Write an enzyme that holds these catalytic residues in place. Structure first.
Site, short mmCIF file in Angstrom:
data_model
loop_
_atom_site.label_atom_id
_atom_site.label_comp_id
_atom_site.label_asym_id
_atom_site.label_seq_id
_atom_site.Cartn_x
_atom_site.Cartn_y
_atom_site.Cartn_z
N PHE A 1 -29.35 -1.32 -25.52
CA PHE A 1 -29.10 -2.28 -26.59
C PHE A 1 -28.34 -3.47 -26.03
CE2 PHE A 1 -24.62 -1.25 -27.74
CZ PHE A 1 -24.48 -0.04 -27.07
N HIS B 1 -21.12 5.03 -25.00
CA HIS B 1 -22.30 4.41 -24.43
C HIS B 1 -21.91 3.71 -23.14
CE1 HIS B 1 -24.90 4.99 -28.01
NE2 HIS B 1 -23.72 5.10 -28.58
N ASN C 1 -28.20 6.30 -26.52
CA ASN C 1 -28.22 7.72 -26.21
C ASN C 1 -28.25 8.52 -27.49
OD1 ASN C 1 -25.50 8.49 -27.05
ND2 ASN C 1 -24.75 7.40 -25.24
N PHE D 1 -24.90 -7.11 -35.15
CA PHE D 1 -24.54 -5.97 -34.33
C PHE D 1 -25.27 -5.92 -32.99
CE2 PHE D 1 -23.16 -4.80 -38.57
CZ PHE D 1 -21.88 -4.31 -38.34
N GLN E 1 -31.94 -3.34 -30.06
CA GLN E 1 -32.16 -2.13 -29.29
C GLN E 1 -33.64 -2.01 -28.96
OE1 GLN E 1 -30.49 1.39 -30.99
NE2 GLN E 1 -31.78 2.79 -29.77
N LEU F 1 -18.12 1.88 -29.84
CA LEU F 1 -19.04 2.55 -28.92
C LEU F 1 -18.41 2.77 -27.55
CD1 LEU F 1 -22.27 0.59 -29.92
CD2 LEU F 1 -21.37 2.77 -30.84
N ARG G 1 -35.37 -1.90 -33.02
CA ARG G 1 -34.25 -1.93 -33.95
C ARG G 1 -33.44 -3.19 -33.69
NH1 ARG G 1 -31.12 3.26 -33.31
NH2 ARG G 1 -32.61 4.04 -34.87
C1 LIG Z 1 -23.21 3.75 -41.36
C2 LIG Z 1 -24.32 2.76 -41.08
N1 LIG Z 1 -24.44 2.53 -39.64
C3 LIG Z 1 -23.88 1.50 -38.89
C4 LIG Z 1 -23.05 0.42 -39.44
C5 LIG Z 1 -21.71 0.37 -39.08
C6 LIG Z 1 -20.90 -0.65 -39.55
N2 LIG Z 1 -19.56 -0.70 -39.23
C7 LIG Z 1 -18.98 0.25 -38.28
C8 LIG Z 1 -17.88 -0.36 -37.44
N3 LIG Z 1 -16.88 -1.01 -38.30
C9 LIG Z 1 -15.77 -1.50 -37.53
C10 LIG Z 1 -14.73 -0.51 -37.12
C11 LIG Z 1 -14.43 -1.50 -38.19
C12 LIG Z 1 -17.53 -2.11 -39.02
C13 LIG Z 1 -18.61 -1.58 -39.94
C14 LIG Z 1 -21.46 -1.59 -40.41
N4 LIG Z 1 -22.76 -1.55 -40.77
C15 LIG Z 1 -23.55 -0.58 -40.29
C16 LIG Z 1 -25.01 -0.61 -40.72
C17 LIG Z 1 -25.62 -1.98 -40.56
O1 LIG Z 1 -25.12 -0.21 -42.09
C18 LIG Z 1 -26.43 0.21 -42.45
C19 LIG Z 1 -24.17 1.70 -37.55
C20 LIG Z 1 -24.94 2.89 -37.46
C21 LIG Z 1 -25.51 3.59 -36.40
C22 LIG Z 1 -26.24 4.75 -36.66
C23 LIG Z 1 -26.37 5.22 -37.96
C24 LIG Z 1 -25.81 4.56 -39.03
C25 LIG Z 1 -25.09 3.40 -38.77
C26 LIG Z 1 -26.89 5.47 -35.56
C27 LIG Z 1 -27.96 6.29 -35.67
S1 LIG Z 1 -28.60 6.65 -34.13
C28 LIG Z 1 -27.27 5.83 -33.40
N5 LIG Z 1 -26.47 5.24 -34.25
C29 LIG Z 1 -27.09 5.78 -31.91
C30 LIG Z 1 -28.37 5.24 -31.25
N6 LIG Z 1 -29.19 6.33 -30.74
C31 LIG Z 1 -30.53 6.24 -30.68
O2 LIG Z 1 -31.16 5.31 -31.17
C32 LIG Z 1 -31.21 7.36 -29.97
C33 LIG Z 1 -32.59 7.74 -30.47
C34 LIG Z 1 -33.10 9.11 -30.09
O3 LIG Z 1 -32.66 9.26 -28.74
C35 LIG Z 1 -32.82 8.00 -28.09
C36 LIG Z 1 -32.44 7.01 -29.16
C37 LIG Z 1 -27.98 4.33 -30.11
O4 LIG Z 1 -27.88 4.72 -28.95
N7 LIG Z 1 -27.70 3.02 -30.42
C38 LIG Z 1 -27.18 2.04 -29.47
C39 LIG Z 1 -25.83 1.56 -29.97
C40 LIG Z 1 -25.99 1.04 -31.39
C41 LIG Z 1 -26.63 2.10 -32.30
N8 LIG Z 1 -27.89 2.57 -31.74
C42 LIG Z 1 -26.96 1.47 -33.63
O5 LIG Z 1 -28.08 1.26 -34.02
O6 LIG Z 1 -25.85 1.14 -34.30
C43 LIG Z 1 -26.04 0.34 -35.50
C44 LIG Z 1 -24.68 -0.24 -35.91
C45 LIG Z 1 -24.88 -1.27 -37.02
C46 LIG Z 1 -24.03 -0.93 -34.70
C47 LIG Z 1 -23.72 0.86 -36.39
#
Ligand SMILES: CCn1c(-c2cc(N3CCN(C4CC4)CC3)cnc2[C@H](C)OC)c2c3cc(ccc31)-c1csc(n1)C[C@H](NC(=O)[C@H]1[C@@H]3COC[C@@H]31)C(=O)N1CCC[C@H](N1)C(=O)OCC(C)(C)C2
Ligand SMILES: Nc1nc2c(ncn2[C@@H]2O[C@H](COP(=O)(O)OP(=O)(O)NP(=O)(O)O)[C@@H](O)[C@H]2O)c(=O)[nH]1
Ligand SMILES: [Mg+2]
EC number: 5.2.1.8
Lengths: 170, 165
Positions: free
Chosen positions: B113, B126, B102, B60, B63, B122, B55
């Site tokens: 990540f 995390h 997580n 952002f 991962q 986060l 990912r």
């Molecule tokens: C709403 C859309 N959207 C966004 C997001 C949000 C924002 N913002 C929010 C914050 N605003 C500021 C306050 C003003 C600005 C706009 C903008 N654009 C986006 C995205 C690009 O729009 C598509 C996100 C995001 C994250 C998730 C789902 C949807 C998300 C999500 C699903 S699962 C998870 N999160 C935790 C995940 N868990 C697992 O993978 C488990 C799997 C099974 O067990 C082991 C393994 C995990 O640990 N990480 C490690 C940590 C980063 C994290 N993944 C991840 O990918 O974050 C992606 C992202 C882009 C950082 C956040």
């Protein structure tokens, strides 16, 4: 060309939005948990003798990003609001999704179906009557599903298309 | 306690991209740092070598760390399938932060990540345990192959990894 329907699947984490969508699109059950960021799928189907294209947005249940949902709610034409029958919190979350859709779309008439998923599991904590009453108060259908056995999967999505069709012709 | 340094040699469709090295904050999160250190050397008989960044979301983070299922759902720690959140002393303050993925409280395994921006929402959820030392430009270059939902357009792998200090 055939009419396209923009369907959006919403609900709390873990309720089975992806499992339901992947059953509809790919005809298999995903047993592992891959929490969704955002996924889109397309499938042509026949509903009530009319071929149409389903464009399905499978959304994240993450509570942290509730403000990020408005954009896809404006774009979507109909919403599957999913909870898990063994997760009372997910059922309570339904109200917030319905209210968010109603607010963002500025309408009580948004095509919507309430879906109670995981009906194959023995640990039911949300009464069927609870869900039936809620759907009736919203004036929308309630469908019980299991992404694991495929019970109700086609019915849930096809019913939502029927709700959109009724809305476009009302 | 002295903070160790580990490295990943990153490849794109099997071709070398560059090396990223990380300082691991064993002085704040010793158990979490030790997990990542041992997974990077492979000394327990399993670890990150050969696994992919599944990912990558430009703006952002990148991962990776699922070396058991190679599909984003797996991974395991040196302590068992999961271990507890050690603490949240360190925060997601900007690009280069290394933090545990997580699926809720106390579900740390091996997935991690690398932030490419500040991800302060986060904080407290995390466990941050390291930071990029050298090769931040390689993490930036990895964003060439990401997308809005994180699906990668080329296979981004840890061709080699180990300990430097
Ligand atoms: C709403 C859309 N959207 C966004 C997001 C949000 C924002 N913002 C929010 C914050 N605003 C500021 C306050 C003003 C600005 C706009 C903008 N654009 C986006 C995205 C690009 O729009 C598509 C996100 C995001 C994250 C998730 C789902 C949807 C998300 C999500 C699903 S699962 C998870 N999160 C935790 C995940 N868990 C697992 O993978 C488990 C799997 C099974 O067990 C082991 C393994 C995990 O640990 N990480 C490690 C940590 C980063 C994290 N993944 C991840 O990918 O974050 C992606 C992202 C882009 C950082 C956040
Ligand atoms: N027994 C059973 N398990 C199900 C059912 N639907 C989903 N699951 C399981 O529940 C877990 C979560 O499913 P998933 O489809 O990922 O849920 P989600 O609503 O898409 N979660 P997210 O919002 O994080 O993307 C998975 O382990 C999946 O196998 C069902 O009908 N029955
Ligand atoms: Mg999902």
């Amino acid at each position: 060309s055939m009419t396209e329907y923009k369907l959006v699947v919403v609900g709390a984490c873990g309720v089975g939005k992806s499992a339901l969508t992947i059953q509809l699109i790919q005809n298999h059950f995903v047993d592992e948990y891959d929490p969704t960021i955002e996924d889109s799928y397309r499938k042509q189907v026949v509903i009530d003798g009319e071929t149409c294209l389903l464009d399905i947005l499978d959304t994240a249940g993450q509570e942290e990003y509730s403000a990020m949902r408005d954009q896809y709610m404006r774009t979507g034409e109909g919403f599957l609001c999913v909870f898990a029958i063994n997760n009372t919190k997910s059922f309570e979350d339904i109200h917030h999704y319905r209210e968010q859709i109603k607010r963002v779309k500025d309408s009580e008439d948004v095509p919507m179906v309430l879906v109670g998923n995981k009906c194959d599991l023995p640990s039911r904590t949300v009464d069927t009557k609870q869900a039936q009453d809620l759907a009736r108060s919203y004036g929308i259908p309630f469908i019980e599903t299991s992404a694991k056995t495929r019970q109700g999967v086609d019915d849930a999505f096809y019913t939502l298309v029927r709700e959109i069709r009724k809305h476009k012709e009302k | 306690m002295v903070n160790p340094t580990v490295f990943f040699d990153i490849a794109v469709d099997g071709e070398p991209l560059g090396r990223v090295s990380f300082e691991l904050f064993a002085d704040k999160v010793p158990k979490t740092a030790e997990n990542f250190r041992a997974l990077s050397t492979g000394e327990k008989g399993f670890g990150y070598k050969g696994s992919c960044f599944h990912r990558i979301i430009p703006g952002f983070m990148c991962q990776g760390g699922d070396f058991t299922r190679h599909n984003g759902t797996g991974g395991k720690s040196i302590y068992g399938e999961k271990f507890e959140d050690e603490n949240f002393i360190l925060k997601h303050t900007g690009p280069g932060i290394l933090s545990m993925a997580n699926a809720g409280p106390n579900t740390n395994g091996s997935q991690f990540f690398i932030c490419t921006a500040k991800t302060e929402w986060l904080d407290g959820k995390h466990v941050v345990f390291g930071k990029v030392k050298e090769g931040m430009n390689i993490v930036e270059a990895m964003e060439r192959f990401g997308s809005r939902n994180g699906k990668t357009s080329k296979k981004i792998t840890i061709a080699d990894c180990g300990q430097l200090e």
